[PDB]
Write a protein that binds this ligand. Structure first.
Ligand SMILES: [Mg+2]
Ligand SMILES: [Mg+2]
Ligand SMILES: [Mg+2]
Ligand SMILES: [Mg+2]
Ligand SMILES: [Mg+2]
Ligand SMILES: [Mg+2]
Ligand SMILES: [Mg+2]
Ligand SMILES: [Mg+2]
Ligand SMILES: [Mg+2]
Ligand SMILES: [Mg+2]
Ligand SMILES: [Mg+2]
Ligand SMILES: [Mg+2]
Ligand SMILES: [Mg+2]
Lengths: 288, 201, 49, 157, 167, 138
RNA sequence: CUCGCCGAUCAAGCAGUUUUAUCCGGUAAAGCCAAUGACUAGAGGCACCUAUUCUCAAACUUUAAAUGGGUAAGAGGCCCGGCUCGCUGGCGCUGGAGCCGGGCGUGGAAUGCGACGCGCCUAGUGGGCCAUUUUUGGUA
RNA sequence: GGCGGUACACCUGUCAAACGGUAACGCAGGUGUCCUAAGGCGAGCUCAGGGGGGACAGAAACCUCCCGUAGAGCAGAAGGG
RNA sequence: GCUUACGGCCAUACCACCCUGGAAAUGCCCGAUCUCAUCUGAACUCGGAAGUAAAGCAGGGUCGGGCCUGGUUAGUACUUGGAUGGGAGACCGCCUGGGAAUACCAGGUGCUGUAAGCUA
């Protein structure tokens, strides 16, 4: 069988971009998202970056530059325990809060927290903030889903709804919000308000506790020890949205000084490298 | 056929047999290695060439004739298993022939293949034992009369058909830098994996 | 009765006879071909200052 | 007679370098081209839109118009014996900033500071480039480098 | 050590019927009574007159089972094989497979309405962590010390199902 | 509605016409049976003599034209159909859509269908109208 | 005809030329143990397979000259303040462009030259031939 | 000159001598069409080939794993992408 | 120093095999009620937190392949301009300037921007 990886293979081999080899960036969609028109002359084109891990949600606002895009404001999902949400830091309701936390924190540093307060109450209807004359214009950014398949009800659009309710003017439509019946092509806003306030999570805690309590303890183990029940879901997120709108500013942790103690071994120098093969040759000639 | 005086000088760009040039007849020479070709490097230390001194092109029929002329003299003076002839010129340039005759559409059909040679390029190479030097020079001398132009019969300083000198070939064998494989040697540098170094020892 | 097809023999001597003059770059270049959206606003920046 | 096609003879100029194929790196898209800067022209076979003609690949002109995706350039093209200023529309993937004037701008900024430094100190530093002058008189020491005898080598074939 | 349990990922089964028509349509009903899900029609790729098939012609059906249904049907297909397979029935990359000539011994009564059909069982063996090669974002490779081998897949067949490898 | 096309034919040179071909003579395609060209003088021009049998019924036609002249060449295309009952006055055929068409007209086939041995006919289309000539079994 | 004539009292600008600076190319050579295509010979591992070897490309190329092509070498500059806009927009400067005022000659490479400046009318010609080098068809 | 050919309107590679241009009845070729999608856009997917496997099933049917810089495909000539 | 998000240059970053590592984080992992989703909850989407390093990932190893850089090849090959230079010719030498490429040899193997967190 002929060898596929020979000298002629690697000599002709052209590697992809590093962010492409890692599978993190889609350069076909990035070009159409971060590149600004040439008749704008360094007008920053902002975008909301929403990323999901197995335990955390990252929401950032950036604008592209040649030496790397700068992050204007970043709100993480592990900051919700400061506002009350100590459980389920990766569900749809926690995505609406980190988007709201990113919207209110951005408007704070830009001096736009008095104007464009968004929807204080959660109604689920399509809301797009309006720019009032005389006052500074609303912040207009765009959504960056990345490699996440944008289906109806994805949590990427949960932070999108949290940002447009905070005051951000992001263009979108209610076709991909949870509660859009594609059969009738109508958006039922009442279903969306349930996912925003975690009401769909409460119905799961009740469907298990009233059927078999054994599985309820495995699925919601940390929900029991933290003292949150199925009846304390809607109110928990409501008072969390209130705390986010009050103090959205995030202070950095005190810089802890470290002696920079390395835990990895260093590369072998040229002396240690040649001396090792010199010992293997000498040890090979003694055995014969 | 047309005499070789008409296709002696390299006037045209190289016109090889390819997808665009179809219908080329087979070259006159088809065998390039003769003698005991499956001999090791330490059997035929001597090497002698037929170096060219003119930038011209040698026909395929001349390479065939001079090969047999040098071969018939080596088999009678050194035996059929005491030499190795390697013709180092392959006929690749296709010379053209105009229609048998105005010149409306004068581009001609292929006539044959002709090997283009440079000043200093080896035409033939013969390796044999160290005591057959006077026979190879005479065998290669008789083959010059089958070629147009001027050729030189130079006894090379390399070790047979290899590219290493004779004064260094014996030292590179003891240092395991060269291993014989058929009619040539393998240059084994000191920059590979250590597994193949232990195989040599 | 064939003739000569194409030639550029004496052309380089005729070009440099009166010299090869570069285009005259005048101050205040023209404004034809510019973006009509940009020119429409620029004419509004001149009738208001 | 040759064909008058727009891409005849562009087999190698519009090709991409070895092991440099694929998508365009996203730095060429985020470069700002104002109106009146010197830009080069170098066509790319990846973007078949707004590509320049082969008579402009390698030329250099100044920008007179900027649009959404492209840039209007004023290139001087000699036709037969006359040089004409051509206004062409080339997208930003086939152009780049010309560093031919950056050596002049850096030299001006260094001149504007040398005269204000000599004015407040009272010197006469000359601000003007000069060709490579003949080498001055210098002593060549032979303390540790004695002249080594060279001579032609015999001919060997 | 616990994250290296040589479990089964999917059990692939297919009936390669000769051509389309009512014979192929009835073959899909066999996969509905065994797997419990609608199969898919796999049309041909190239036309070959030696077999009597054309391009874009529905030739074979196939289905995939993942969970405990994959373990049940695979066990129900090994009792026909007498819980023993050949030595060369294992591929050099883990997974193996076999085949039966009649599906009646697979827990379904023989009916005179629909004809008898023979499927082709192919089990794709796995290991916790193989999903890193299937997910889109952050797609990676498995590794040398984690992918299954032939000697590792045969001993799993001898311990879980007490199989006998015939040389 | 997509009734038909507009080209319906194409003209080409007379010297490019080959034997056993087709060409338009007197407004109807004909089967060229033999072609011969001859000179006219010292520096004579290629005088082409054509003779073709009309493919439809009868009435062979001929014509003289120079080699460098142009003459209309028709589009000769033949389609296959499946036979149906011909017990009526018109011959019936079916297309790929599955619908029947009855526009044609022979004696050896109109009664053949009643006794078995089904066949498929090849209807040839040309400038004027359509007609069926060849018959091959399967 | 518009000027310069007075020489860098002046702004200058220009060039079949160099210098400095920055781009463009795929020819000569080179390579094929690198891809496409052609090609000779042994050797190793159980016809292929691996590592080598001889010889080539005008419609092949990783690499790549020499000669050569474009551009930049200042007041039409540099810097600063204010104003205008329906364009642009988190951000009366957020970009951008226009407008107005002020500050600053050590005209900020070599050599040469009045600008071969701005127009108008315009005859003849539209069979060429030869040489050094490059080069196509052809035995020539 | 005639016959032949169209070098008569166009396109690809080369000739063409590393900007562009550059001839011959120079070379290898292509065109007078095709497409309601083979146009536009979004999403998902990865191709040619090779290896190990798997009832009938074989060198060619289909299922599946592994390698796979594109060596496939992109209506047509060729080049580029 | 490390772990993530978004990147710039796009192999000094890739490829094969081996070894070591989980503080935070990451990954695997545990489920299919809701949203969504396929032949199949594998993928995609969604809900979650029993286990903690098998793999991803990260850091090392290889007289590693590749890539990158330098030396050398060589002032060689080729080339601008010149001669009433040589030569039957092919072609070659010289004068005046520019000046490569493989093989071979050696060294190196990601750098870095913005934002957040942790001192294994
Ligand atoms: Mg040599
Ligand atoms: Mg003329
Ligand atoms: Mg003429
Ligand atoms: Mg003249
Ligand atoms: Mg052509
Ligand atoms: Mg001036
Ligand atoms: Mg004329
Ligand atoms: Mg005239
Ligand atoms: Mg033609
Ligand atoms: Mg040229
Ligand atoms: Mg461990
Ligand atoms: Mg290495
Ligand atoms: Mg090097």
């Amino acid at each position: 069988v002929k060898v596929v990886k020979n000298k002629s293979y690697f000599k002709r081999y052209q590697v992809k971009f590093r962010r492409r080899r890692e599978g993190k960036t889609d350069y076909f969609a990035r070009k159409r998202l971060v590149i600004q028109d040439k008749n704008k002359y360094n007008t920053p084109k902002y975008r909301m970056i929403v990323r999901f891990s197995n335990r955390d949600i990252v929401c950032q606002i950036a604008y592209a530059k040649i030496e790397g895009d700068m992050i204007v404001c970043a709100a993480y999902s592990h900051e919700l325990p400061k506002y009350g949400i100590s459980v389920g830091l990766t569900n749809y309701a926690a995505a609406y809060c980190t988007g709201l936390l990113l919207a209110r924190r951005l408007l704070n540093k830009f001096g736009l927290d008095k104007v464009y307060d968004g929807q204080v109450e959660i109604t689920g209807d399509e809301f797009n903030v309006e720019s009032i004359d005389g006052q500074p214009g609303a912040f207009t950014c765009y959504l960056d889903a990345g490699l996440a398949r944008t289906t109806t009800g994805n949590k990427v659009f949960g932070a999108l709804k949290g940002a447009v309710d905070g005051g951000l003017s992001i263009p979108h439509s209610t076709k991909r919000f949870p509660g859009y019946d594609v059969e009738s092509k109508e958006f039922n806003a009442e279903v969306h308000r349930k996912h925003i306030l975690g009401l769909n999570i409460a119905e799961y805690m009740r469907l298990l506790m009233e059927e078999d309590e054994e599985c309820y303890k495995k699925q919601f183990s940390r929900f029991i020890k933290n003292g949150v029940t199925a009846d304390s879901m809607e109110e928990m997120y409501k008072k969390a949205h209130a705390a986010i709108r009050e103090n959205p500013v995030h202070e950095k942790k005190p810089k802890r000084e470290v002696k920079k103690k390395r835990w990895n071994r260093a590369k072998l120098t040229l002396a240690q490298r040649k001396d090792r093969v010199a010992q293997k040759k000498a040890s090979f000639l003694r055995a014969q | 056929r047309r005499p070789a005086r008409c296709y002696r000088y390299c006037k045209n760009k190289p016109y090889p047999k390819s997808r665009f040039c179809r219908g080329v007849p087979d070259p006159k020479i088809r065998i390039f290695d003769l003698g005991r070709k499956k001999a090791k490097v330490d059997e035929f230390p001597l090497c002698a060439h037929m170096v060219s001194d003119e930038y011209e092109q040698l026909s395929s029929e001349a390479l065939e004739a001079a090969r047999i002329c040098a071969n018939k003299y080596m088999v009678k003076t050194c035996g059929k298993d005491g030499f190795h002839i390697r013709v180092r010129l392959h006929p690749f340039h296709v010379i053209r022939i105009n229609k048998m005759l105005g010149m409306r559409g004068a581009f001609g059909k292929p006539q044959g293949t002709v090997a283009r040679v440079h000043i200093g390029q080896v035409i033939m190479s013969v390796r044999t034992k160290a005591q057959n030097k006077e026979h190879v020079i005479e065998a290669l001398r008789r083959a010059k009369f089958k070629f147009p132009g001027r050729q030189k019969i130079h006894v090379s300083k390399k070790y047979g058909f290899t590219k290493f000198n004779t004064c260094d070939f014996d030292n590179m064998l003891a240092e395991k830098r060269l291993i014989p494989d058929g009619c040539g040697v393998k240059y084994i540098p000191s920059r590979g994996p250590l597994s193949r170094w232990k195989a040599l020892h | 009765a064939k003739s000569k097809n194409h030639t550029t023999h004496n052309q380089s001597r005729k070009w440099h006879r009166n010299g090869i003059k570069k285009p005259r770059s005048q101050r205040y270049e023209s404004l034809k071909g510019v973006d009509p959206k940009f020119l429409r606003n620029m004419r509004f920046a001149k009738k208001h200052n | 007679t040759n064909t008058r096609g727009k891409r005849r003879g562009t087999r190698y100029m519009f090709a991409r370098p070895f092991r440099k194929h694929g998508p365009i790196p996203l730095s060429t898209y985020m470069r700002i081209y104002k109106k009146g800067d010197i830009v080069d022209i170098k066509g790319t076979g990846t973007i078949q839109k707004g590509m320049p003609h082969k008579c402009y690949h390698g030329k250099t002109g100044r920008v007179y118009n900027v649009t959404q995706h492209a840039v209007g350039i004023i290139v001087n093209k000699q036709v037969k014996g006359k040089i004409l200023a051509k206004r062409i529309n080339v997208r930003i993937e086939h152009i780049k900033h010309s560093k031919s004037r950056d050596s002049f701008l850096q030299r001006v900024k260094e001149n504007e500071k040398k005269k204000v430094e000599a004015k407040k100190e009272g010197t006469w530093i000359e601000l003007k480039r000069q060709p490579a002058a003949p080498r001055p008189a210098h002593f060549v020491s032979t303390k540790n480098n004695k002249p080594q005898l060279l001579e032609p080598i015999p001919y060997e074939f | 050590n616990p994250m290296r349990e040589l479990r089964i990922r999917k059990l692939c089964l297919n009936i390669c019927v000769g051509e389309s028509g009512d014979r192929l349509t009835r073959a899909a009903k066999v996969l509905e009574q065994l797997t419990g899900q609608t199969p898919v029609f796999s049309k041909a790729r190239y036309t070959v007159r030696s077999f009597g098939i054309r391009r874009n012609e529905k030739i074979a059906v196939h289905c995939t089972v993942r969970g405990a249904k994959a373990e049940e049907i695979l066990e129900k297909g090994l009792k026909v094989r007498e819980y023993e397979l050949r030595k060369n029935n294992f591929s050099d990359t883990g997974n193996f497979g076999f085949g039966i000539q009649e599906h009646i011994d697979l827990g379904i009564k023989y009916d005179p309405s629909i004809g008898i059909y023979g499927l082709d069982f192919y089990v794709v063996l796995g290991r916790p962590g193989f999903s890193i090669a299937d997910k889109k974002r952050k797609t990676g490779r498995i590794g040398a010390k984690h992918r299954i081998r032939k000697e590792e897949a045969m001993r799993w067949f001898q311990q879980k199902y007490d199989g006998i490898i015939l040389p | 509605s997509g009734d038909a096309g507009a080209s319906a034919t194409y003209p080409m040179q007379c010297s490019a016409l080959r034997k056993n071909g087709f060409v338009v003579l007197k407004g109807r395609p004909c089967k060229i049976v033999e072609m011969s060209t001859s000179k006219t003088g010292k520096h004579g021009h290629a005088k082409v003599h054509l003779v073709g049998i009309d493919i439809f019924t009868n009435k062979k036609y001929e014509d003289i034209c120079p080699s460098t002249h142009n003459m209309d060449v028709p589009n000769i295309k033949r389609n296959d159909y499946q036979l149906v009952d011909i017990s009526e006055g018109f011959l019936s055929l079916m297309m790929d859509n599955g619908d029947v068409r009855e526009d044609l007209r022979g004696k050896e086939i109109e009664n053949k269908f009643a006794a078995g041995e089904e066949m498929l006919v090849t209807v040839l289309s040309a400038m004027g109208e359509e007609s069926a000539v060849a018959l091959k079994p399967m």
